[PDB]
Design a protein around this nucleic acid. Sequence first.
RNA 1: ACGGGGCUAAACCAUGCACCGAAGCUGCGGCAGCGACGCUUAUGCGUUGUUGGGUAGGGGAGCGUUCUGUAAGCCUGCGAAGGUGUGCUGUGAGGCAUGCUGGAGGUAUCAGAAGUGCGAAUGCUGACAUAAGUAACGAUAAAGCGGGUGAAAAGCCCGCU
RNA 2: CCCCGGCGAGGGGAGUGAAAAAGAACCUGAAACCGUGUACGUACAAGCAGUGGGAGCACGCUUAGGCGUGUGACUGCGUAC
Lengths: 117, 110, 34, 142, 56, 150
Amino acid sequence: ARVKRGVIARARHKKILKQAKGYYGARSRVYRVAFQAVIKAGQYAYRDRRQRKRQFRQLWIARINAAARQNGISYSKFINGLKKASVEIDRKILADIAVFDKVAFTALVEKAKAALA
Amino acid sequence: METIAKHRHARSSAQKVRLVADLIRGKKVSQALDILTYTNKKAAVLVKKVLESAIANAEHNDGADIDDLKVTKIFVDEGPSMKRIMPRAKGRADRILKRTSHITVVVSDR
Amino acid sequence: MENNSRTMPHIRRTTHIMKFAHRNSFDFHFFNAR
Amino acid sequence: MKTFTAKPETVKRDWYVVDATGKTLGRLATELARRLRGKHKAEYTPHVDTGDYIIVLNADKVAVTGNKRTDKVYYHHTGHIGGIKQATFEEMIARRPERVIEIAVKGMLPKGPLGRAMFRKLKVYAGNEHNHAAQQPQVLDI
Amino acid sequence: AVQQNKPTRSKRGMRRSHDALTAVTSLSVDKTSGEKHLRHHITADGYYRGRKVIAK
Amino acid sequence: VTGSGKKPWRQKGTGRARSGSIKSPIWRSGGVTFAARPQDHSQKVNKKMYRGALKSILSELVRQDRLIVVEKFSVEAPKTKLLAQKLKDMALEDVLIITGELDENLFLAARNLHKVDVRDATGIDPVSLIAFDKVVMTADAVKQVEEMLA
RNA sequence: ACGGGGCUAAACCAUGCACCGAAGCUGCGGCAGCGACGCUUAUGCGUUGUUGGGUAGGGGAGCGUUCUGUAAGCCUGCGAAGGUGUGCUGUGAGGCAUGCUGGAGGUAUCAGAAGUGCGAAUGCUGACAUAAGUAACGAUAAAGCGGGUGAAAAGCCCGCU
RNA sequence: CCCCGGCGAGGGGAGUGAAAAAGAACCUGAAACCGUGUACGUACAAGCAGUGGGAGCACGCUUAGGCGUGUGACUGCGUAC
Ligand SMILES: NCCC[C@H](N)C(=O)O
Ligand SMILES: [K+]
Ligand SMILES: [K+]
Ligand SMILES: [K+]
Ligand SMILES: [K+]
Ligand SMILES: [K+]
Ligand SMILES: [K+]
Ligand SMILES: [K+]
Ligand SMILES: [K+]
Ligand SMILES: [K+]
Ligand SMILES: [Mg+2]
Ligand SMILES: [Mg+2]
Ligand SMILES: [Mg+2]
Ligand SMILES: [Mg+2]
Ligand SMILES: [Mg+2]
Ligand SMILES: [Mg+2]
Ligand SMILES: [Mg+2]
Ligand SMILES: [Mg+2]
Ligand SMILES: [Mg+2]
Ligand SMILES: [Mg+2]
Ligand SMILES: [Mg+2]
Ligand SMILES: [Mg+2]
Ligand SMILES: [Mg+2]
Ligand SMILES: [Mg+2]
Ligand SMILES: [Mg+2]
Ligand SMILES: [Mg+2]
Ligand SMILES: [Mg+2]
Ligand SMILES: [Mg+2]
Ligand SMILES: [Mg+2]
Ligand SMILES: [Mg+2]
Ligand SMILES: [Mg+2]
Ligand SMILES: [Mg+2]
Ligand SMILES: [Mg+2]
Ligand SMILES: [Mg+2]
Ligand SMILES: [Mg+2]
Ligand SMILES: [Mg+2]
Ligand SMILES: [Mg+2]
Ligand SMILES: [Mg+2]
Ligand SMILES: [Mg+2]
Ligand SMILES: [Mg+2]
Ligand SMILES: [Mg+2]
Ligand SMILES: [Mg+2]
Ligand SMILES: [Mg+2]
Ligand SMILES: [Mg+2]
Ligand SMILES: [Mg+2]
């Protein structure tokens, strides 16, 4: 029962090189380099599913901070005021109203200034 | 209609013939023949005989006219190499490649 | 001896080529870590 | 829904003019770097230049505290061996005073192609006059 | 002295960006025979500048 | 493998991986690492396990309606056409015939029918009792299997 | 000899209230292991508690390849194996369908047996790169011209130096 | 058999054959490697060359929109096995 390897080994190598499309040089042509590059792309993709949640909250906070200072209050006093006024809107929606409905953001600031005073 | 002539297993490397084939790509065949006449390369002799043969194939087999033909495609491919042995110092042997090439000229009046 | 070389059948003893201490230009002052 | 990003073909940029007479050097430079980057706008995007154009007048009259007018030393190297060169704050003011504000603002900007394009919107002058009246710069009393 | 890394096909084509041939631009036309030739060279019939210089 | 035991090159100095034999299984044309021998693949079955397996197979042929008991089953001349006509008169196509002791008219007539095996009662085996669709035993063959299986 | 810019606080001490900050904790959705109790199981489901970083190493469960039986069956010139694309699908090894190429083989299911899975061993054999159109073209005794032949002559033939 | 070519090599027709990209360097014809064409990017820009975000352009769809494919300016993180 002698087994030859040609059909199985080619399909395994072709699966790796399909995932390595777009890569530079030997990373899209050569199996020894492409296999190594597909694994490093998988460690990066796992790590950046965690960093995607940090980088968007960092972006929302900087946009709330900019729009709150257009109404005379800082970020840390605007968040404290919305917590005292029991407003449960999160930073993703607050940064979105700050861009698309600037009047409705002013109404939230006056709600937060009222609870602090 | 396109018309092809080829020289297969031409005894020169593809890198040396590709320098001459880049001179006449896209030209009218009247202009391309006189560029090849005054190019001082051995590959210019080889490309001229393939272009002269593609011209004659288009007149005879395709009924074309000479004053409207242009070099639409021209490309040089690598052929098989002949392995030779070269003695070096102190008992060393190197391996000599004698590279060949495939020349392909396509003339078209459109 | 290397008796069945297909790349170089003409030669059997070849370490005068690549072994540094067996070349004809080897000097013993290269071996000074003593 | 995806988060808004500013598109560079539709970015609103404005023109301002700042008088630097008697201002502290670093406290003026942090506000300059905020507005060149665009941190004061709600449309802020970290990879888009959404900032403003700023004209700075009277760069030779900026102020520093302490003994920094004789003790702040600016270093650079020329690339040749032994070629380290220094200059005090007063030597920079007396020779090329627009460089003092430009160096301080460049160190507060991001490093890369985008921060080099943010720096291009800063227009520093040593005197009280500029020739950008066609851009109609608004007086920013910061 | 020899390389520590294999240079790429990108680096090979950048070096060959100065290897291109220049074509001769203006063959002259002899004013008696009408034959094309190089400038300041005789024709293949042996004319030069209107007269038969090489009776061959 | 045919070849000598000469070391292909020396141990140290040539700048190349060390070798000791041209017949190494790493090399092309070299030996097989765990090259095989002729072996005996036969297993032992206990006598009671062989007889206990036959009684279960025979009980399933009674249960799954695949066992046929007649009293007579033979042909009259050693002709293939006689048995093929006889079996389609009984709606039997693929069948094992077990008889008491073997008639040679029947043994010759079924040598060409590829779906039909004719056996005597002692030459049964557990695989052909499962591999054929129907099993026809004569009435004198059934009493021999009972004395064989105690 | 602040990470830098810069700083007379943007430094230090004391007190206070905010906010940022991790794969920690919470929220929502999903999978699996080990206990406990049960619509009742026939060995699976339901409820609940808890657990799930991992080398050496121990335990458990699977994928795929070639060959044998099932198979004188089933699929296939109305196109098999192989090759090359695309779509769908599973937690994974993988699976399924189909366009083009190819031109005669392939094989379900449940079992059985292994030359059963490769990136490394200065592994072995073949093919092809790189340096690179780079070094070199083998004695520094030496060539010049006219004619001939030829598709083509610095090197061949003839002649004179 | 005709044509180019040195009464070459090699090729283009024609013809045979189910097929000549089955043409004798001959079944199938993978990969490394080398070219031609097209779309997008690229000549103020610093590093394991990816990954997360993402504008523009091109080509398909199908609509009272924004999806698919290719490319990837700019930007956070990131020193192969
Ligand atoms: N006795 C002389 C044998 C020579 C051989 N080719 C060698 O290289 O040894
Ligand atoms: K021997
Ligand atoms: K197929
Ligand atoms: K290896
Ligand atoms: K080369
Ligand atoms: K010489
Ligand atoms: K074929
Ligand atoms: K081929
Ligand atoms: K290929
Ligand atoms: K990036
Ligand atoms: Mg030599
Ligand atoms: Mg010798
Ligand atoms: Mg070595
Ligand atoms: Mg063998
Ligand atoms: Mg016995
Ligand atoms: Mg038979
Ligand atoms: Mg620090
Ligand atoms: Mg908080
Ligand atoms: Mg978190
Ligand atoms: Mg967390
Ligand atoms: Mg957790
Ligand atoms: Mg674990
Ligand atoms: Mg854990
Ligand atoms: Mg089988
Ligand atoms: Mg198969
Ligand atoms: Mg297919
Ligand atoms: Mg094996
Ligand atoms: Mg391998
Ligand atoms: Mg390994
Ligand atoms: Mg071979
Ligand atoms: Mg070979
Ligand atoms: Mg080599
Ligand atoms: Mg060099
Ligand atoms: Mg040189
Ligand atoms: Mg030289
Ligand atoms: Mg010589
Ligand atoms: Mg001479
Ligand atoms: Mg002569
Ligand atoms: Mg034909
Ligand atoms: Mg046919
Ligand atoms: Mg055949
Ligand atoms: Mg073939
Ligand atoms: Mg091919
Ligand atoms: Mg540029
Ligand atoms: Mg510059």
